Amino acid sequence: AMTMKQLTNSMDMMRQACAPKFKVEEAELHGLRKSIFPANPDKELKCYAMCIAQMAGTMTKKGEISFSKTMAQIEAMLPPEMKTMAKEALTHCKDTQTSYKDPCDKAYFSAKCAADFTPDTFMFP
Ligand code: NA
Ligand code: NA
Ligand code: NA
Ligand code: NA
């Protein structure tokens, strides 16, 4: 798997690829990295999160969060410091998207469920 430093480098690249497309600012982005997710973000932040999950190949053509490739991702890619938190969060949070129709809401609120469940060391790009 990746080391923590390699994962950070990969997450910074994802953020560089996605953030410029959306009307987001540094503070709210720093917040998600530190696993602090607003309950009521504006739409641009929700779609930033979707862009990210899409980029990590965790999103479906249907505009849904894919359990199976997320698991494969986590297994192959994550360092021990993140891997067990991510597996537990995915199982804990897998039904979140069913309360939402819009794909940006599915992505963002699934990631919020994960952020809220885990401690502050669980990073999002
Ligand atoms: Na590595
Ligand atoms: Na919550
Ligand atoms: Na967290
Ligand atoms: Na938390």
Side-chain angles (χ1 to χ4, degrees):
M2 295 184 163
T3 64
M4 271 289 251
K5 198 167 308 189
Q6 283 165 348
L7 184 66
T8 300
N9 291 351
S10 161
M11 295 196 172
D12 288 341
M13 188 147 64
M14 294 178 84
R15 168 209 254 156
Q16 286 314 301
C18 284
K21 307 186 171 325
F22 302 104
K23 296 170 175 195
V24 294
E25 53 79 42
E26 62 189 341
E28 76 197 319
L29 300 178
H30 189 60
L32 316 176
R33 183 59 62 89
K34 301 200 98 204
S35 222
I36 313 168
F37 277 60
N40 252 329
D42 45 58
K43 182 61 154 23
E44 303 277 321
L45 192 63
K46 295 193 261 181
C47 291
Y48 165 73
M50 190 182 65
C51 184
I52 294 292
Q54 278 177 334
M55 178 145 295
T58 282
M59 284 267 314
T60 75
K61 176 139 179 52
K62 281 235 79 213
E64 288 192 299
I65 293 301
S66 177
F67 188 93
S68 171
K69 219 171 92 167
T70 310
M71 268 302 179
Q73 288 283 74
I74 293 169
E75 283 305 325
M77 300 285 272
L78 293 185
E81 304 75 37
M82 290 282 286
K83 185 188 191 257
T84 294
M85 271 189 277
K87 292 141 61 78
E88 305 283 344
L90 184 64
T91 65
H92 193 91
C93 287
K94 69 197 171 216
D95 293 308
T96 311
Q97 61 176 333
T98 64
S99 319
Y100 302 96
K101 245 49 196 162
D102 184 273
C104 291
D105 294 355
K106 300 198 180 282
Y108 176 88
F109 291 108
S110 304
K112 185 169 167 55
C113 178
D116 288 355
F117 174 78
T118 59
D120 283 15
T121 46
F122 191 69
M123 320 191 287
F124 181 92

